[PDB]
Amino acid sequence: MMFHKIYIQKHDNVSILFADIEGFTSLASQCTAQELVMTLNELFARFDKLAAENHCLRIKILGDCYYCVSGLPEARADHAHCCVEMGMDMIEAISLVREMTGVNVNMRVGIHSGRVHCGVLGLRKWQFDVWSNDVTLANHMEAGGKAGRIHITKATLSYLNGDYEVEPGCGGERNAYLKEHSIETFLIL
Amino acid sequence: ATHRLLLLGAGESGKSTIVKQMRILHVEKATKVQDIKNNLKEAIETIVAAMSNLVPPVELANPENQFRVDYILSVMNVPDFDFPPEFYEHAKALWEDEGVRACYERSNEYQLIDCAQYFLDKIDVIKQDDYVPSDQDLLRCRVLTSGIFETKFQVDKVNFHMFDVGGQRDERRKWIQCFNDVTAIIFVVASSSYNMVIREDNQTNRLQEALNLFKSIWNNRWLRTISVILFLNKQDLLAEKVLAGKSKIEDYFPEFARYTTPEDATPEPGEDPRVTRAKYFIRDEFLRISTASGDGRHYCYPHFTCAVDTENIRRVFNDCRDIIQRMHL
Amino acid sequence: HQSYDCVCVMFASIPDFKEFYTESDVNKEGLECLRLLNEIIADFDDLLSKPKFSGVEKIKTIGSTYMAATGLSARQYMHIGTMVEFAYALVGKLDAINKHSFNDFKLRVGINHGPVIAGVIGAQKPQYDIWGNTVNVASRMDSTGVLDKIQVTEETSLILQTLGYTCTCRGIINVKGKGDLKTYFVNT
Numbered sequence: 001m002m003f004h005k006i007y008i009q010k011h012d013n014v015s016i017l018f019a020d021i022e023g024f025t026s027l028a029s030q031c032t033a034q035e036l037v038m039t040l041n042e043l044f045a046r047f048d049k050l051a052a053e054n055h056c057l058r059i060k061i062l063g064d065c066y067y068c069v070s071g072l073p074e075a076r077a078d079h080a081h082c083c084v085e086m087g088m089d090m091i092e093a094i095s096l097v098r099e100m101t102g103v104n105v106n107m108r109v110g111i112h113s114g115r116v117h118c119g120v121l122g123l124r125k126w127q128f129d130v131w132s133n134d135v136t137l138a139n140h141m142e143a144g145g146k147a148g149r150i151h152i153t154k155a156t157l158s159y160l161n162g163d164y165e166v167e168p169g170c171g172g173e174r175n176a177y178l179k180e181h182s183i184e185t186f187l188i189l
Numbered sequence: 190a191t192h193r194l195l196l197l198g199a200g201e202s203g204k205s206t207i208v209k210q211m212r213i214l215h216v217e218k219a220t221k222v223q224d225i226k227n228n229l230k231e232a233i234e235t236i237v238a239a240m241s242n243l244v245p246p247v248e249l250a251n252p253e254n255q256f257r258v259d260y261i262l263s264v265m266n267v268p269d270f271d272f273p274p275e276f277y278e279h280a281k282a283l284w285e286d287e288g289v290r291a292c293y294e295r296s297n298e299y300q301l302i303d304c305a306q307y308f309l310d311k312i313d314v315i316k317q318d319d320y321v322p323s324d325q326d327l328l329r330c331r332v333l334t335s336g337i338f339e340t341k342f343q344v345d346k347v348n349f350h351m352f353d354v355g356g357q358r359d360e361r362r363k364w365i366q367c368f369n370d371v372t373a374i375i376f377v378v379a380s381s382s383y384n385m386v387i388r389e390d391n392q393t394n395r396l397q398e399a400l401n402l403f404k405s406i407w408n409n410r411w412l413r414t415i416s417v418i419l420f421l422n423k424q425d426l427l428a429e430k431v432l433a434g435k436s437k438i439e440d441y442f443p444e445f446a447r448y449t450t451p452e453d454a455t456p457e458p459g460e461d462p463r464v465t466r467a468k469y470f471i472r473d474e475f476l477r478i479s480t481a482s483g484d485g486r487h488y489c490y491p492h493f494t495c496a497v498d499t500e501n502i503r504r505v506f507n508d509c510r511d512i513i514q515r516m517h518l
Numbered sequence: 519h520q521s522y523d524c525v526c527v528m529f530a531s532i533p534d535f536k537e538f539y540t541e542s543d544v545n546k547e548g549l550e551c552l553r554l555l556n557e558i559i560a561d562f563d564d565l566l567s568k569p570k571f572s573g574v575e576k577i578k579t580i581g582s583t584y585m586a587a588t589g590l591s592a593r594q595y596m597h598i599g600t601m602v603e604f605a606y607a608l609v610g611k612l613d614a615i616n617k618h619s620f621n622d623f624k625l626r627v628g629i630n631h632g633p634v635i636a637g638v639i640g641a642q643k644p645q646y647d648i649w650g651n652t653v654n655v656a657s658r659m660d661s662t663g664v665l666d667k668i669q670v671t672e673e674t675s676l677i678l679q680t681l682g683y684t685c686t687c688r689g690i691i692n693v694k695g696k697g698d699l700k701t702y703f704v705n706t
């Protein structure tokens with residue numbers, strides 16, 4: 001074999017959640033690196049606990065971006081609810097941490113459901129990850145989301161079985177990717 | 190057993206055509222009519238447009254025809270052309286004008302599709318409203334390939350998944366996607382395009398480009414153990430150019446002046462010594478590359494080919510089935 | 519979480535990859551595109567074994583962007599110069615990749631240096647990462663850079679110069695969250 005062995009496997013019917021700190025660069029520009037990492041660690045460790053309960057699997061942390069998915073490793077039907085529930089717990093966590101810290105912590109949540117290829121790349125410093133247009137869309141939904149709210153796509157809503165009262169998301173106005181691809185958005189209540 | 194074969198070669202080498210033969214051999218005509226009419230139109234306007242730009246310029250053998258020329262050029266860039274009965278009359282009038290014909294004999298000095306002569310020789314057939322494309326018409330109709338296409342077929346209950354890709358420089362970036370897990374590679378080459386240059390830049394010799402592309406595929410880091418079946422396609426047009434005597438091979442490839450026909454060489458019944466020599470010379474330029482590196486990790490299988498001949502393809506593809514199944518590919 | 523003083527971070531992106539990535543039946547829903555990315559990232563990881571690069575710590579792979587740093591091991595400023603030598607090496611690897619895959623991928627690098635905090639974060643897995651304003655500005659030097667060029671900050675420009683490198687003023691660009699910053703392009 002001339003192509004390196006690739007550790008990747010496809011998975012259908014999964015949900016992805018993206019959450020990102022608002023104006024993180026601006027934040028790190030005022031408080032000490034030591035102090036920032038602590039506020040960030042206070043928040044992300046709390047997130048890692050919530051994920052275990054909600055049956056969501058944490059992928060990785062990119063500074064202020066935090067993402068996880070449901071339907072991994074083993075398939076699940078309750079999948080889209082888990083992420084909605086996860087966001088619910090997350091948005092609340094941030095509030096408590098903002099309360100006791102005094103730091104301006106605010107995150108945008110974005111969810112979409114579909115397929116993903118997942119595994120690792122390269123030979124060194126392996127880290128499990130996800131790849132697909134669906135994952136690309138999820139990331140854009142977070143960018144298109146609104147502070148302290150759980151922004152979702154129509155594909156995700158078709159998996160909630162109507163257990164949540166939502167409202168027009170208007171993502172096509174906030175993010176050019178969502179518009180050009182004709183994505184119908186919704187905000188959870 | 191399921192073998193996945195990938196078709197590679199420079200633009201216009203005849204890949205898409207090889208696939209059509211697999212359909213006609215082992216597997217909505219009205220849709221192809223518009224395409225045939227497009228080849229017919231593109232041909233007449235390409236020849237006419239090159240008349241004034243050549244050096245020296247070619248002159249019309251009839252003043253009357255200048256009006257048909259002005260007509261042709263005026264409707265050149267038209268999007269939705271309805272093909273009035275006047276169009277075929279004008280086209281045919283020009284194609285009979287010796288000036289136009291002489292310009293056609295110098296078509297290696299500009300970019301002209303391969304089916305020019307074929308379709309122009311039968312304008313009266315294509316113009317009919319009850320016109321139904323023959324098998325030879327569909328095999329000639331040229332239409333650029335963009336993106337990957339996967340064909341399926343069976344031969345004695347053996348499965349073949351064929352992949353057809355774009356051969357033009359840009360389209361090549363996609364080839365990679367078919368590299369992993371390929372049984373064999375079929376590399377097509379337009380043997381007759383030695384006196385020509387690629388569309389992409391209008392300078393690089395067509396055969397040279399092929400040679401480079403082959404050497405790139407043969408020594409690819411990902412195709413180290415993938416054997417390559419080589420179709421020295423367009424055999425018919427090669428022989429015609431050779432015998433014609435106008436465009437001399439040794440003027441494009443100086444090495445030809447030293448080349449002599451090998452002893453183990455097998456000519457076709459009644460084949461001209463000159464033709465035998467040309468086709469074999471071209472074969473060796475390709476073999477010379479494949480012989481420099483490999484070490485039995487992978488091999489090269491030459492084949493004289495003529496894609497538009499449903500008969501020659503039947504025969505050669507049978508030589509191919511032998512190659513695949515035999516060597517355990 | 520150990521605190522560092524002088525660390526050189528680098529973000530090398532392949533902006534053209536996203537476009538090359540497609541999802542079709544032929545390419546197995548984008549698996550074949552990832553096979554190429556896998557090859558690319560591997561070809562980059564092999565440089566870490568070259569003795570001249572033993573001081574380079576591969577942090578992680580963000581998407582198709584390669585993130586690394588030098589100085590996590592502490593002739594003073596040479597580690598920052600070594601980072602630039604690695605940025606050039608990555609280009610040589612991508613040109614090799616281009617030759618065999620018939621593509622024209624170009625790397626876009628952003629380098630910066632300063633204080634950082636290194637360590638593991640979170641309760642799931644023990645992934646070593648680095649933080650700080652420095653890391654943020656490094657990444658901005660990448661996202662606002664140019665293809666085939668290494669974009670460095672003014673402070674890094676000075677240091678690279680004492681080491682014998684020549685820079686070119688990019689101008690004064692407004693970096694999101696930071697404001698007007700004066701940047702430089704390293705001269706190949």
Ligand SMILES: Nc1nc2c(ncn2[C@@H]2O[C@H](COP(=O)(O)OP(=O)(O)OP(O)(O)=S)[C@@H](O)[C@H]2O)c(=O)[nH]1
Pocket residue numbers: 198199200201202203204205206207303304328329330331332333334335354355356357422423424425426494495496497498
């Ligand atoms: N005379 C002759 N014409 C041929 C032969 N093989 C192909 N052609 C013609 O050459 C033209 C180009 O062939 P085609 O199959 O379209 O090229 P291709 O390799 O698929 O081209 P591309 O899609 O990479 S741009 C067509 O008109 C075809 O009929 C041959 O053996 N003899």
Ligand SMILES: C=C[C@@]1(C)CC(=O)[C@]2(O)[C@@]3(C)[C@@H](O)CCC(C)(C)[C@@H]3[C@H](O)[C@H](OC(C)=O)[C@@]2(C)O1
Pocket residue numbers: 129130131132133135136139535536539555580581582583
């Ligand atoms: C490799 C291709 C492709 C399309 C796959 C994919 O889903 C991504 O890797 C995600 C979305 C995805 O892996 C989640 C993490 C992150 C960092 C958000 C990625 C980047 O945005 C990638 O783009 C870049 C620019 O690297 C992107 C979009 O690239």
Ligand SMILES: Nc1ncnc2c1ncn2[C@@H]1CC[C@H](COP(=O)(O)OP(=O)(O)OP(=O)(O)O)O1
Pocket residue numbers: 020021022023024025026061062063064580647648649650653654657658694695
């Ligand atoms: N350890 C790290 N790993 C990966 N990426 C990192 C790391 N540290 C920082 N980053 C990156 C580069 C800068 C980026 C954070 O900026 P981001 O793009 O989120 O903008 P922002 O938070 O200022 O504003 P916003 O998200 O609201 O648009 O995260």
Ligand SMILES: [Cl-]
Pocket residue numbers: 198199200201202377378379380382395396399
């Ligand atoms: Cl060719």
Ligand SMILES: [Mg+2]
Pocket residue numbers: 020021022023024025064065
């Ligand atoms: Mg942010």
Ligand SMILES: [Mg+2]
Pocket residue numbers: 201203204205206332333334354355356
């Ligand atoms: Mg074709």
Ligand SMILES: [Zn+2]
Pocket residue numbers: 020062063064065
């Ligand atoms: Zn971010």
Ligand SMILES: [Zn+2]
Pocket residue numbers: 339350
């Ligand atoms: Zn198939």
